[PDB]
Amino acid sequence: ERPTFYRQELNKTIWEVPERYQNLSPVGGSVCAAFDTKTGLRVAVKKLSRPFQSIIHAKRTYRELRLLKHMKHENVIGLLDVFTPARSLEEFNDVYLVTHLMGADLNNIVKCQKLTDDHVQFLIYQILRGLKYIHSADIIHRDLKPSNLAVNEDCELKILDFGTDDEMTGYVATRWYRAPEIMLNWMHYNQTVDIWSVGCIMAELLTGRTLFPGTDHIDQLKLILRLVGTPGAELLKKISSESARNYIQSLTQMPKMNFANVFIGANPLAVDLLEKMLVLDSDKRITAAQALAHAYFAQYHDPDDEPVADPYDQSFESRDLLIDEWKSLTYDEVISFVPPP
Numbered sequence: 340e341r342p343t344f345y346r347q348e349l350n351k352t353i354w355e356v357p358e359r360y361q362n363l364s365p366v367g368g369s370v371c372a373a374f375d376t377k378t379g380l381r382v383a384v385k386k387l388s389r390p391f392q393s394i395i396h397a398k399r400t401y402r403e404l405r406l407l408k409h410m411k412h413e414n415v416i417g418l419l420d421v422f423t424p425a426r427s428l429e430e431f432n433d434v435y436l437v438t439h440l441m442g443a444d445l446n447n448i449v450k451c452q453k454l455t456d457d458h459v460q461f462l463i464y465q466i467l468r469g470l471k472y473i474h475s476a477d478i479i480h481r482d483l484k485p486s487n488l489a490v491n492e493d494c495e496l497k498i499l500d501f502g503t504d505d506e507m508t509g510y511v512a513t514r515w516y517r518a519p520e521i522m523l524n525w526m527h528y529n530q531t532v533d534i535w536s537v538g539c540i541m542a543e544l545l546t547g548r549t550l551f552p553g554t555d556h557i558d559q560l561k562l563i564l565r566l567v568g569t570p571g572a573e574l575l576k577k578i579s580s581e582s583a584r585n586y587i588q589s590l591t592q593m594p595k596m597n598f599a600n601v602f603i604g605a606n607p608l609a610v611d612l613l614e615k616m617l618v619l620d621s622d623k624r625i626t627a628a629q630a631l632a633h634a635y636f637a638q639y640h641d642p643d644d645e646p647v648a649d650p651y652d653q654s655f656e657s658r659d660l661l662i663d664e665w666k667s668l669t670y671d672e673v674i675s676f677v678p679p680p
């Protein structure tokens with residue numbers, strides 16, 4: 340049966356939610372912290388803003404719901420609930436998404452300081468465990484950074500936000516964790532972009548400092564190539580962008596630096612893993628599954644406790660539909676939702 344809904348204005352927006360959700364408080368569509376009286380969980384409730392205003396927006400709403408409904412893993416943000424106050428498809432215009440409330444993000448944890456090697460092991464282990472799962476469903480995060488890695492008091496981690504030009508401009512953390520092939524659109528990229536991001540994050544946990552804090556795209560590329568070396572003939576061929584390939588060749592060649600001299604005092608196993616993650620040629624980067632079996636994670640690794648995902652049908656991604664068609668599909672997904680045990 341349909342629960343009773345009550346109304347409240349919070350972010351100059353009217354939130355209409357089931358009675359079970361109490362003490363709604365803004366934290367950041369708009370997001371509110373709340374207490375789910377049915378489960379006893381502290382939750383985050385996200386109300387999507389104008390979910391069906393255009394074809395692009397309607398498809399994005401469907402995409403986010405499909406992604407969240409699929410993810411069922413300890414280290415990945417999943418759906419506790421999804422609801423609409425609408426009683427029918429014709430009334431349907433708002434979507435609310437509910438997940439676990441996490442206390443902080445990784446930026447709050449690092450706070451300009453070094454973490455202990457054990458803390459780094461545990462945090463990177465969980466990220467990679469979550470990524471193995473996400474990647475196994477043929478999903479790419481594409482935008483991994485400390486701000487979308489949420490953590491509780493016990494350092495337990497979940498991945499958020501998986502799946503404009505102005506905000507990528509300049510001295511900005513929005514670009515610092517991006518693989519060079521996507522920052523400069525070198526080629527058709529794949530899952531390996533996420534491993535680059537993990538490398539950048541891991542380095543920052545170890546040193547307390549941004550690995551590649553570029554002041555712009557070009558400055559960042561220079562910082563990258565100084566560490567990992569300029570591309571060889573092999574990688575150059577794979578840069579399908581003739582323009583990008585042409586620019587790359589104009590740069591003075593540089594050898595790969597010694598990572599042990601860059602990361603002074605770090606666990607030699609951490610240095611080794613960083614060398615395997617921060618490879619310029621994406622074809623040759625370590626995968627999440629391979630990284631989990633690396634000696635650095637010896638105390639956490641368990642091949643029987645690192646699950647993969649059920650098949651994820653994303654044929655909708657190459658489909659062209661009307662607004663009302665994406666809207667109907669979204670409605671079907673809301674109505675059919677089954678809460679976790």
Ligand SMILES: Fc1ccc(Oc2ncc3c(NC4CCOCC4)n[nH]c3n2)c(F)c1
Binds near residue numbers: 444
């Ligand atoms: F179903 C969802 C999916 C993602 C959502 O977005 C979101 N945003 C944020 C959080 C959060 N905590 C953040 C962590 C970073 O600092 C601010 C609070 N815990 N859970 C969260 N979920 C959401 F609210 C509902």
